[PDB]
Design a protein around this ligand. Structure first.
Ligand code: CA
Ligand code: CA
Lengths: 207, 210
DNA sequence: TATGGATCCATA
DNA sequence: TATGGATCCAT
């Protein structure tokens, strides 16, 4: 997979240029988001482009989470204290890791988004909450760009649609990364779809 | 319907105490969110409680919207300049009205959220954007409470679930309203899901104003 | 290729 | 029991 678009707040740029741990942290996330391949036999991510919204999205996150977890030792589904300790409501963020050296400690929160675009607003808010309460020093969201999302399940998170809201992160170290497939062709298999929501396969007890 | 839970930021409290137009705005919203009644013929809103998620959410909003639009002159689909003009990306606000008393104008943005809880974060962030850029002076979000939502379409926005995030509206005038039915019974018809529960009512679009 | 939903899923 | 995801829908 490729990182095509990217927004980095002023506070995040300052860390990326002056702090090694954030540079290391940033390096590990980029290499991870680029990891997804398709099909399993390929070295690159190719998206089937037969029709609009033809591919499901479930398998996309796999390799990204494997590298982050297995190789980089990141923590999956990390619950925030503000959420499950104090307020006792809401779930954990996708990934989290503590970058340490000497007395310095940098905590990075992150969310990978292939859920509905509205789900990305929650993700941004959770990370904003975690940043406000001093649990993470940097927040990062990963999501497909519109060109790629056009071939994925209708209404999934796309960089361009969440973009008008990036400013709601002012004064806080945040980074938004939009990813894209390396090739677009009808020579590959369709990424399978679930029976979720309004899929013709979902059980609807109303008709 | 009943308004059972509510969070009012301190900035909104102040406006509600010192400003009569904001006081009027609130009362129109309050009366509108209490207007829904199940059995169109019924006095109050009784919700069928036979199963988990047994009712659709669309008809629940009809009376509230209709009172705000037709009786109180609120408009639907007010595009924000920051979104329509500057960023040229993003949809409009759900309900909008400009209050006037002489030289004073009070713009109130409001979203009636019966979408997925994740959609509520979009609603709040959009009102926050309108607020931050001085396009509105007060934001309002209507949503059922957890107990009511248990019998509504799975994962619908609910007061308690958005609650952890109310603090993100800090330093800005915002109102969160949680409503609930007056009764739960199995002898009232199910609120239909899908197209059956869609009203083909023409709404008062802001674009069609003067 | 726009946009806020409405609904049902999968895991706990 | 609760919570983050995923899939189409109506305009
Ligand atoms: Ca997650
Ligand atoms: Ca995610």
């Amino acid at each position: 997979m490729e990182v095509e678009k990217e927004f980095i707040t002023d506070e995040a740029k300052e860390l990326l240029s002056k702090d090694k741990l954030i540079q290391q942290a940033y390096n590990e996330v980029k290499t991870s988001i680029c990891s997804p391949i398709w099909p399993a036999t390929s070295k690159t991510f190719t998206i089937n482009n037969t029709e609009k919204n033809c591919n499901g999205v479930v398998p996309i996150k796999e390799l990204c989470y494997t590298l982050l977890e297995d190789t980089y030792n990141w923590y999956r589904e990390k619950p925030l204290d503000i959420l499950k300790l104090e307020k006792k409501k809401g779930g954990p963020i996708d990934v989290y890791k503590e970058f340490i050296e000497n007395s310095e400690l940098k905590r990075v929160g992150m969310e990978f988004e292939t859920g509905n675009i509205s789900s990305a607003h929650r993700s941004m808010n959770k990370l904003l909450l975690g940043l406000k309460h001093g649990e993470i020093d940097l927040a990062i969201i990963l999501m497909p760009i519109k060109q790629l999302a056009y071939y994925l399940t209708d209404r999934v998170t796309n960089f361009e649609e969440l973009e008008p809201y990036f400013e709601l992160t002012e004064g806080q170290p945040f980074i938004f990364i939009g990813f894209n497939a390396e090739a677009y062709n009808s020579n590959v298999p369709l990424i399978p779809k679930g029976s979720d929501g309004m899929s013709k396969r979902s059980i609807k007890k109303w008709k």
